UniProtKB/TrEMBL annotation, chain B:
The gene is psaA. This is Photosystem I P700 chlorophyll a apoprotein A1. The chain holds residues 76 to 149 of 745 of the full protein. It comes from Nannochloropsis oceanica. The PsaA/B heterodimer binds the P700 chlorophyll special pair and subsequent electron acceptors. PSI consists of a core antenna complex that captures photons, and an electron transfer chain that converts photonic excitation into a charge separation. The eukaryotic PSI reaction center is composed of at least 11 subunits. Belongs to the PsaA/PsaB family. The chain crosses the membrane at residues 1-16. PsaA and PsaB bind P700, the primary electron donor of photosystem I (PSI), as well as the electron acceptors A0, A1 and FX. PSI is a plastocyanin/cytochrome c6-ferredoxin oxidoreductase, converting photonic excitation into a charge separation, which transfers an electron from the donor P700 chlorophyll pair to the spectroscopically characterized acceptors A0, A1, FX, FA and FB in turn. Oxidized P700 is reduced on the lumenal side of the thylakoid membrane by plastocyanin or cytochrome c6. It is found in: Plastid, Chloroplast thylakoid membrane.
UniProtKB/TrEMBL annotation, chain D:
GO terms for cellular component: chloroplast thylakoid membrane; photosystem I. Its main location: membrane. May help in the organization of the PsaE and PsaF subunits. InterPro entries: PSI_PsaJ (IPR002615), PSI_PsaJ_sf (IPR036062). The keyword Transmembrane applies. PANTHER family: PHOTOSYSTEM I REACTION CENTER SUBUNIT IX, PTHR36082. This is Photosystem I reaction center subunit IX. The gene is psaJ. Keywords: Chloroplast, Membrane, Photosynthesis, Photosystem I, Plastid, Thylakoid, Transmembrane, Transmembrane helix. Belongs to the PsaJ family. GO terms for biological process: photosynthesis. It comes from Nannochloropsis oceanica.
UniProtKB/TrEMBL annotation, chain F:
This is Photosystem I reaction center subunit III. It comes from Nannochloropsis oceanica. InterPro entries: PSI_PsaF, PSI_PsaF_sf. Keywords: Chloroplast, Membrane, Photosynthesis, Photosystem I, Plastid, Signal, Transmembrane, Transmembrane helix. The chain crosses the membrane at residues 83-99, 119-139.
From TrEMBL, chain G:
It is a multi-pass membrane protein. InterPro entries: PSI_PsaA/B, PSI_PsaA/B_CS, PSI_PsaA/B_sf, PSI_PsaB. The chain crosses the membrane at residues 50-69, 132-154, 175-196, 270-288, 331-352, 372-392, 419-439, 518-540, 576-597, 646-666, 708-731. GO terms for cellular component: chloroplast thylakoid membrane; photosystem I. Keywords: 4Fe-4S, Chlorophyll, Chloroplast, Chromophore, Electron transport, Iron, Iron-sulfur, Magnesium, Membrane, Metal-binding, Oxidoreductase, Photosynthesis, Photosystem I, Plastid, Thylakoid, Transmembrane, Transmembrane helix, Transport. Chlorophyll a B1 binds at residue 655. It comes from Nannochloropsis oceanica. PROSITE patterns: PHOTOSYSTEM_I_PSAAB. Its EC number is 1.97.1.12. Its main location: plastid. This is Photosystem I P700 chlorophyll a apoprotein A2. GO terms for biological process: photosynthesis. SUPFAM superfamilies: Photosystem I subunits PsaA/PsaB (SSF81558).
Length: 120, 74, 75, 41, 180, 160, 735
């Protein structure tokens, strides 16, 4: 939801060169872009899902052996989180921002549906 | 259960029927008290029962019974 | 089943119908019960086959549900 | 509400709920996209 | 079983590459309905050798223009077979007979259930003493080179077929074989 | 074209069918009054009929001599949206259903009262298994490889 | 109460009427008779075979005599397309004047002949009511021969032993070569000598046959090797059958297709066919070993056929002794082959009519196809029933097993669960989806939107039609192409005749097909698979199951195993046959309904009626049954009657017998025993009737007997009502 909210705000502002990528409205951009770019995103997200969870992808398969902190993919290239004191605060901030972004992603999508122009 | 069934019959007569139109023309309007939703092409079941109404013709005689009861309004 | 068949055919053939303004009575089937309900072939043809015409020709009309239920009840 | 939820977990109630939900989303797909003889794509 | 067979190298880690576990389905349920690993390896060698020969046979005639004298000058593998089938029927008949004889002598039918006197792609056939006297590791390395080149030729021929069927499937292909 | 059929966009009998259906619907529409709900319903019927006929015309659909869309299910991808894509969709959904059913049967089969958990479903475990069926093609070709998909000789056999 | 079941003392001691009922139904089960040996079994079967062939020949002689005496064969010769053949005259005292007038044909009331014997006898060269009489005389003589042989081979010095009966190689050599090849050779001789000139106006009878050359060159080309001379100058395209106008001199040709006038196969084509078949079968009859040291020993052939890798177990090692020592295995094989053969006859005698003017005889076409398909279903069910009987009473696991490993037949009982499960899966698959598509079409058409129908073009079957030369589906495949090697190869032999016939809208050769054909073929496949499932399940489960692991100890036919273990109704293998008879009747009904409706639409010209209405069930019910039943039911009305009155009476009779079968099937015993006890008390306690008492105690029919009687009523009513419907509908619709 956070990535998708940022995607809305950037899409209506920046956009890519080309006739396909010329819709400030995210909902209408979902249709104008066509199925080919979207299906590639779907397949890439699937590849990511497979490799990040290392095969065990389902509710019964994941956490079957334990030893898996929920949400812990080990992704930390920039090194933020070495200090354990701020780690808990960062986790809480991520959770709160994620919830707020779920609410906001619903809000933006439904604004685009009831008005049709953009978010602004 | 029987009372619920009777309540359903009376509710259909009140809301999804041409009872008022049938009262003014009993001999030329066919009693109908069930309209069919327009899905999968099933709306053809809504027949020309008369009285500016579309629905399934009713053969349970509720319209005649209600008229015999003196019921003149939905 | 025999009772309701007797009722349906007898009423349609010898009670129900229309009355002309001069008083002439014309029935739904035309009085065929008296002479054709006395044989099993008569029941098969002049009642079952004859009055089943409306059920089999109901497709595309508002009575098509009756044809569908006819087939489903056979099934 | 401990045995009522167990009653709702019985085979008939669960099958009725699942079939009602299934018929519901089928009927609503056929309402919003009616007369679909072939795959939309 | 795959750990002690030629075919895996650094390109796929150090383990035998088998995402679908097709090498271990022979031991599964049924007396035999799925091929043994020996049959799969013989299919490896046969398909790879055929693919290498076919790559040479689409490159040399079609591009370089070299042709057998009394044969049609068709730089197209989708029509050359029929063109030679009509132009020189005797040559194609003899080629088919030679192929049938070679395969019948080197029959691999006991490989389906595992077993047989031969090895995977043994075939004898060492005229110019390339493996006359060599270490076992050297022979294994040469076999691995052959298998990998066969896989590469398989990929190249599949790319040829795909580009002929679906245009633009291999982007660099027409820029790497400028003539048909 | 295929099998002597012709595209429905150029089938005269198809357009005759459309015209006859529309004419019947309009004749039915004539016997009602003004913007009354019956007329609205009949107009919606006419609009839906026209939309359906137009969509069938522009759908790579082959029509016979009766002006009805015929399905080409020999396997060609040209008419792949008629059978092949719905076939894949059903195979996915039905494999999902079968996989979740089998997983639930095998999961509650190792508890103290396996038969009780079949008339009174463990809704938490049922929900856990059901949403895990999206990987049924992968789960099936990961349990067959391990030999956990097929029984061998504990299965019972009759006397002969 | 004694001496009737002479073959069974257990039945003869029954004090009830069950002894009489079971005496009839066990008379031909010779293996179960008292004081029974194998030699007596084979000898009695041999004599019964002789009596049976005598009965067949007497039946054919009766048909010939009644056509010669009361028919109009000679009149039908001069006008085969307008004169309706007469089977036999009618003398029934119950006729009124109206019935006499309606059935009156020429001089006496008579029945039209729907057996197609007129066309068959006309084709083989019969032109006189004295030719038919000669055939009847000869066939009665042959029947006398067979009866004498049957009596003779029960005499002491002429009764064959078991070794002679089980001499497989000798019987195969003789049957194949002698029976098939030599009978085909003699039939080619007759075809040429008599039939070929008779179709060209030259009469070749039992007087001028030693002096009338079948070919002008006269056996010179055959010995000289110039066999092409027999094919030169065939019948032209303007040849009038039975007349010399436009005829030829050839006797063995390839022409393909049909005669331009009779719309039937060329007589020279069929003579060549039978000559080739004769040569092939005579050659194939020398395969097996006899007293001259060369040939095959089939025991060795069967034993040596074990795949080396090993997937059929030990192969066919124990099959020779298994088949030889069992008469039910051989009977099942013969019945299966005969069922396939008569299915072939039905499927080919309508697409490739072999008899002159038979294509235009629509009622006889329908009657022949229906008759042969019903016989085919009966034969197939009998084959499977006798396979089950072999499993119950003749199968020996020790013979079919060598050192633990099982042979090809014994392994069928190891994966029996797999076979039954997959038959069940196929049946459920086909039924679910055929019914789903049919009901989808029903609902969609009923709602007034036929465009939403699911109509699958039978491309696979249309592909086959194009492969044989039909240029209707634009496939350009093998014979639809003039450049394919398949066409260039026969462009000079039989394509011009074959292509001219396959690409013709008036033929039944490769009838054009559509989505309705697809759906009905899937229905036929479902019926075949379900009947096979029932029969195979009964055969494999005959020796036992989980519910009855000792079913072999109770025999092929027993009522049940009791109400214990949850209930064991219809658990015997006989009950599987009994259940599969309904499915066979249903499948044959579907096949015959499809054939008859397709051909009624083809003959009437409204083939668009079938192509549109055959995709949904109400289409069938309204346009086949309800539509074509109108002429039949009006065979007699309160106003009069027609010659179709007998067919309406048979229609009602079939319905009545069907519902009496319903009686015997729904209501079981126990309810009929107490009622019979009440009747017994009433008879015993009434004056003026106490003077009369039964000798056999009246009891209710047994469970198995009741099932058989209900099945017999069901089947007889089914057959009678459908025969009446098809015949009367064809006659009353197509003039
Ligand atoms: C259980 C399955 C199911 C699902 C997934 C939906 C889904 C939906 N329904 Mg719905 N609906 C269902 C069953 C279901 N319905 C049933 C059983 C009824 C009663 C017969 C309704 C009556 C109903 C109404 C009256 C409306 C919806 C509407 C809607 C849509 C917006 C909410 C959505 C597509 C709304 C819609 O989209 O209409 C504009 C709307 O107005 N539904
Ligand atoms: C078993 C055979 C069978 C098959 C293959 C079909 C197939 C079809 N029927 Mg049908 N039907 C059948 C039996 C069958 N029916 C029976 C027995 C009846 C009688 C009750 C009907 C009554 C019927 C009607 C009344 C209608 C259909 C319609 C349809 C079509 C639209 C399907 C649909 O809603 O897709 C859309 C829905 C889905 C694809 C559901 C799956 C979606 C999931 C949620 C995807 C999620 C995962 C990603 C389709 C071609 C409709 C039509 O338009 O016909 C052309 C229509 O109006 N059928
Ligand atoms: C003819 C096709 C074919 C077949 C039969 C095989 C078979 C084999 N390969 Mg192989 N391979 C192939 C093509 C093929 N390969 C190609 C084109 C490449 C280049 C990408 C490779 C690259 C490769 C590597 C890198 C390795 C193997 C290995 C193996 C062995 C174990 C895996 C197995 O059982 O696969 C069975 C495969 C099949 C039955 C083929 C099914 C293909 C289906 C139809 C899908 C194809 C389209 C997608 C086995 C002998 C491993 C090995 O040698 O272990 C020691 C190993 O390490 N192969
Ligand atoms: C029924 C088919 C059949 C069978 C059982 C055999 C059997 C044999 N062949 Mg052989 N062969 C066949 C067809 C067959 N052939 C055909 C069509 C050709 C091409 C002309 C050859 C060419 C051939 C050569 C060149 C040689 C053999 C050899 C052999 C022998 C052992 C080596 C071997 O199998 O490798 C050869 C294996 C094959 C050629 C594979 C053939 C696969 C066939 C075509 C598949 C048919 C199966 C199919 C389901 C049948 C349908 C049945 C029905 C529906 C019609 C063995 C006796 C060798 C020999 O003589 O040893 C001394 C040998 O050198 N075969
Ligand atoms: C040449 C010598 C000869 C001949 C002519 C016969 C003839 C006959 N024997 Mg016989 N027999 C012989 C030698 C011979 N036998 C010897 C040497 C032995 C001792 C070893 C026996 C032992 C023997 C026994 C024990 C019995 C007979 C029986 C019979 C009769 C079989 C019933 C019948 O009428 O079939 C007539 C059949 C035809 C005219 C031909 C049938 C045509 C078929 C159905 C068509 C097939 C075409 C095609 C293949 C269909 C498939 C299509 C294709 C594409 C696959 C028949 C008359 C039986 C009988 O009834 O006894 C009285 C019997 O029980 N025989
Ligand atoms: C070297 C010895 C020899 C050769 C080459 C021939 C060759 C021939 N003989 Mg012959 N013949 C021979 C010795 C020989 N005969 C002897 C020793 C006798 C007995 C003394 C005969 C008696 C004989 C007769 C009676 C006839 C022939 C005929 C023929 C011819 C018919 C062949 C044919 O088309 O098959 C025909 C194929 C079949 C009949 C079935 C296959 C053929 C040219 C026939 C003929 O008319 O020749 C012109 C003929 O009627 N032969
Ligand atoms: C040439 C073929 C052939 C042969 C030789 C046999 C021979 C045999 N069968 Mg068999 N069978 C056959 C075909 C054959 N069958 C077919 C086609 C079927 C499937 C229908 C069967 C089904 C079958 C079963 C299920 C059983 C046998 C049994 C038997 C054995 C005892 C027969 C007996 O007791 O008769 C008894 C004869 C009768 C009871 C007479 C029945 C007459 C029927 C009801 C028709 C009469 C009505 C008639 C049409 C009236 C017309 C009505 C009018 C108003 C129009 C015997 C070895 C039995 C056995 O124990 O085998 C070991 C057994 O259980 N068979
Ligand atoms: C119209 C009547 C009718 C119907 C629909 C069936 C249907 C069936 N019979 Mg059946 N049967 C019937 C009459 C009928 N029978 C009669 C009169 C007899 C004589 C006693 C038999 C004797 C019989 C035997 C002996 C066997 C069957 C079998 C079957 C199944 C075959 C597989 C199949 O088609 O699955 C598809 C199922 C259907 C199309 C019907 C049910 C589908 C409904 C409409 C779903 C609705 C959901 C809401 C199926 C359930 C066989 C079986 O069990 O195979 C597994 C089997 O062994 N039947
Ligand atoms: C995300 C969301 C919807 C996202 C939709 C998307 C992406 C749709 C994409 C598409 O449409 C397009 C673009 C094109 C279509 O053709 C295809 C699809 C692909 C379908 C809705 C969220 C919807 C989110 C909703 C409705 C949230 C409701 C939250 C409530 C009520 C919270 C209440 C509380 O927070 C308070 C008020 C106080 C707290 O203390 C207590 C509680 C009770 C927790
Ligand atoms: C139970 C049992 C039994 C019985 C069984 C049965 C009854 C079976 C049946 C069977 C059957 C009934 C089978 C069938 C078969 C068939 C087939 C096998 C066919 C084939 C065909 C073919 C192969 C063809 C081909 C072709 C084509 C397609 C085209 C044209 C040409 C040709 C020829 C090539 C017995 C007694 C034995 C024993 C015991 C057990
Ligand atoms: C009606 C019926 C009866 C009663 C029918 C009986 C007892 C048959 C009555 C006699 C019939 C009508 C034949 C009568 C023949 C004459 C008496 C002449 C004698 C002929 C014999 C010598 C062969 C059963 O016994 C029965 C048993 C099990 C399941 C279902 C049923 C069942 O449905």
């Amino acid at each position: 939801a956070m990535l998708a909210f940022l995607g809305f705000i950037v899409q209506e502002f920046i956009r890519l060169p080309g006739d396909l990528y010329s819709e400030p409205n995210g909902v209408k951009a979902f249709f104008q872009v066509g199925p080919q770019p979207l299906l590639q995103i779907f397949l890439f997200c699937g590849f990511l899902e497979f490799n990040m969870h290392k095969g065990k992808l389902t509710q019964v398969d994941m956490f079957e052996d334990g030893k898996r902190e929920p949400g812990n993919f080990g992704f930390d290239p920039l090194g933020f989180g070495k200090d354990p004191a701020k780690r808990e605060r960062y986790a809480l901030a991520e959770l709160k921002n994620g919830r707020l972004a779920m609410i906001a992603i619903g809000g933006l999508v439904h604004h685009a549906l009831v008005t049709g122009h953009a978010t602004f | 259960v029987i009372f619920l069934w009777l309540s359903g019959m009376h509710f259909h007569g009140a809301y999804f029927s041409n009872y008022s139109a049938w009262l003014t023309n009993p001999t030329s309007t066919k009693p109908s008290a069930q309209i069919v939703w327009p899905i999968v092409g099933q709306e053809v079941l809504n027949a020309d029962v008369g009285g500016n109404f579309q629905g399934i013709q009713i053969t349970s005689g509720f319209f005649q019974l209600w008229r015999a009861e003196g019921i003149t309004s939905e | 089943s025999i009772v309701i068949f007797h009722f349906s055919w007898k009423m349609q053939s010898d009670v129900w119908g229309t009355v002309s303004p001069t008083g002439a009575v014309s029935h739904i089937t035309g009085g065929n019960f008296a002479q054709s309900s006395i044989t099993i072939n008569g029941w098969l043809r002049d009642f079952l086959w004859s009055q089943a015409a409306q059920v089999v020709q109901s497709y595309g009309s508002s009575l098509s549900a009756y044809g569908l239920i006819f087939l489903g009840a056979h099934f | 509400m401990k045995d009522f939820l167990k009653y709702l977990s019985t085979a008939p109630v669960l099958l009725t709920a699942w079939l009602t939900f299934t018929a519901g989303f089928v009927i609503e797909i056929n309402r919003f996209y009616p007369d679909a003889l072939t795959f939309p794509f | 079983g795959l750990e002690n067979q030629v075919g895996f190298d650094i390109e796929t880690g150090g383990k035998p590459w088998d995402p679908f576990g097709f090498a271990g389905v022979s031991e599964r349920n049924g007396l035999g309905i799925l091929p043994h690993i020996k049959w799969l390896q013989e299919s490896e060698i046969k398909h790879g050798r055929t693919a290498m020969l076919a790559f040479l046979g689409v490159i040399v005639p079609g591009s370089l223009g070299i042709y057998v004298p009394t044969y049609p000058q068709e730089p197209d593998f989708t029509k050359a077979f029929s063109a030679a089938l009509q132009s020189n029927p005797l040559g194609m008949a003899q080629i088919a007979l030679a192929v049938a004889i070679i395969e019948g002598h080197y029959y691999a039918g006991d490989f389906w259930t595992g077993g047989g006197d031969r090895q995977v792609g043994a075939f004898g056939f060492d005229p110019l003493g390339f493996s006359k006297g060599k270490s076992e590791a050297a022979i294994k390395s040469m076999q691995l080179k052959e298998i990998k080149n066969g896989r590469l030729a398989m990929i190249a021929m599949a790319a040829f077929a795909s580009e002929k069927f679906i245009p633009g499937s291999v982007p660099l292909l027409h820029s790497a074989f400028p003539t048909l | 074209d295929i099998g002597g059929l012709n595209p429905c966009k150029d089938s005269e009998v198809f357009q005759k069918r459309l015209a006859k259906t529309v004419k019947k619907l309009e004749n039915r529409l004539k016997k009602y009054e003004e913007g009354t709900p019956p007329q609205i319903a009949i107009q919606q019927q006419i609009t839906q009929t026209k939309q359906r006929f137009t969509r069938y015309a522009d759908s790579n659909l082959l029509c016979g001599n009766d002006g009805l869309p015929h399905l080409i299910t020999d396997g060609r991808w040209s008419h792949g949206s008629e059978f092949l894509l719905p076939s894949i969709l059903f195979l996915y959904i039905s494999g999902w259903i079968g996989w979740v059913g089998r997983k639930y049967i095998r999961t509650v089969g190792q508890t103290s009262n396996p038969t009780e958990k079949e008339i009174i479903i463990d809704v938490p475990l049922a929900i856990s298994i059901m949403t895990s069926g999206f990987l049924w093609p992968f789960a099936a070709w990961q349990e067959f490889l391990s030999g956990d998909l097929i029984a061998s000789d504990e299965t019972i056999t009759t006397s002969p | 109460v004694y001496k009737f079941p002479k073959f069974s003392k257990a039945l003869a001691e029954d004090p009830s009427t069950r002894r009489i009922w079971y005496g009839i139904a066990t008379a031909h089960d010779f293996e179960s008779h008292d004081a029974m040996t194998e030699s007596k079994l084979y000898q009695k079967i041999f004599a019964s075979h002789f009596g049976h062939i005598a009965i067949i020949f007497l039946w054919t002689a009766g048909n010939l005599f009644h056509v010669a005496w009361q028919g109009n064969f000679e009149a039908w010769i001069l006008n085969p397309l307008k004169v309706r053949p007469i089977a036999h005259a009618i003398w029934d005292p119950h006729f009124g004047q109206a019935a006499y007038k309606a059935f009156l044909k020429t001089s006496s009331p008579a029945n039209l002949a729907l057996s197609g014997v007129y066309e068959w006898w006309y084709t083989i060269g019969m032109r006189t009511n004295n030719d038919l009489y000669q055939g009847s005389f000869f066939l009665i003589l042959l029947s006398s021969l067979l009866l004498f042989a049957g009596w003779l081979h029960l005499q002491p010095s002429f009764r064959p032993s078991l070794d002679w009966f089980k001499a497989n190689e000798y019987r195969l050599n003789h049957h194949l070569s002698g029976l098939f090849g030599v009978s085909s050779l003699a039939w080619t001789g007759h075809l040429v000598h008599v039939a070929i000139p008779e179709s060209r106006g030259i009469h070749v009878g039992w007087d001028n046959f030693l002096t009338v050359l079948p070919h002008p060159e006269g056996l010179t080309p055959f010995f000289s090797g110039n066999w092409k001379a027999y094919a030169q100058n065939p019948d032209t395209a303007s040849h009038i059958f039975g007349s010399g106008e436009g005829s030829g001199t050839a006797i063995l040709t390839f022409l393909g297709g049909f005669h331009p006038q009779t719309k039937s196969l060329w007589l020279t084509d069929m003579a060549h066919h039978h000559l080739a078949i004769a040569v092939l079968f005579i050659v194939a009859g020398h395969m097996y070993r006899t007293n001259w040291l060369i040939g095959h020993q089939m025991k060795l052939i069967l034993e040596a056929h074990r795949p080396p890798g090993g997937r059929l177990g030990i192969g066919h090692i124990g099959l020779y002794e298994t088949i030889t020592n069992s008469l039910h295995f051989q009977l099942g094989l013969a019945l299966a082959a005969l069922g396939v053969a008569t299915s072939l006859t039905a499927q080919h005698m309508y697409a490739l009519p072999p008899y002159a003017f038979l294509a235009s005889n629509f009622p006889t076409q329908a009657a022949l196809y229906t008759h042969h398909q019903y016989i085919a279903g009966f034969l197939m069910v009998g084959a499977f029933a006798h396979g089950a009987i072999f499993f119950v009473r003749d199968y020996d696991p020790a013979v079919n097993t060598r050192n633990g490993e099982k042979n090809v037949l014994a392994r069928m009982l190891e994966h029996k669960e797999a076979i039954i499960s997959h038959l069940s899966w196929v049946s459920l698959f086909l039924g679910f989806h055929t019914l789903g598509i049919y009901v989808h079409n029903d609902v969609v058409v009923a709602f007034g939107q036929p465009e939403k129908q699911i109509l699958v073009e039978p491309l696979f079957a249309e592909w086959i039609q194009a492969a044989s030369g039909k240029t209707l589906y634009n496939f350009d495949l093998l014979l639809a192409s003039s450049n394919s090697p398949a066409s260039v190869a026969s462009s000079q032999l039989w394509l011009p005749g074959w292509l001219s016939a396959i690409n013709d809208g008036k033929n039944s050769l490769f009838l054009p097909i559509g989505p309705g054909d697809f759906l009905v073929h899937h229905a036929i496949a479902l019926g075949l698979h379900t009947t096979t499932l029932i029969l195979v399940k009964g055969a494999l489960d005959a020796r036992g199951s989980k519910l009855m692991p000792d079913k072999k100890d109770f025999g092929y036919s027993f009522p049940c195993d009791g109400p214990g273990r949850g209930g064991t109704c219809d658990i015997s293998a006989w009950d599987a046959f009994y259940l599969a008879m309904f499915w066979m009747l249903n499948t044959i009904g579907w096949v015959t309904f499809y054939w008859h409706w397709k051909h009624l639409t083809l003959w009437q010209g409204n083939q668009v009626q079938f192509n549109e209405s055959s995709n949904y069930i109400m289409g069938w019910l309204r346009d086949y049954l309800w539509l074509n039943s109108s002429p039949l039911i009006n065979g007699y009305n309160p106003f009069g009657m027609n010659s179709l009155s007998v067919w309406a009476w048979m229609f009602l009779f079939g319905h009545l017998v069907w519902a009496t079968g319903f009686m015997f099937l729904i209501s079981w015993r126990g309810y009929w025993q107490e009622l019979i006890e009440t009747i017994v008390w009433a008879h015993e306690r009434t004056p003026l009737a106490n003077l009369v008492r039964w000798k056999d105690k009246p009891v209710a029919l047994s469970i198995v007997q009741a099932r058989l009687v209900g099945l017999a009523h069901f089947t007889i009513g089914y057959v009678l009502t459908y025969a009446a419907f098809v015949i009367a509908s064809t006659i009353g619709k197509l003039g």
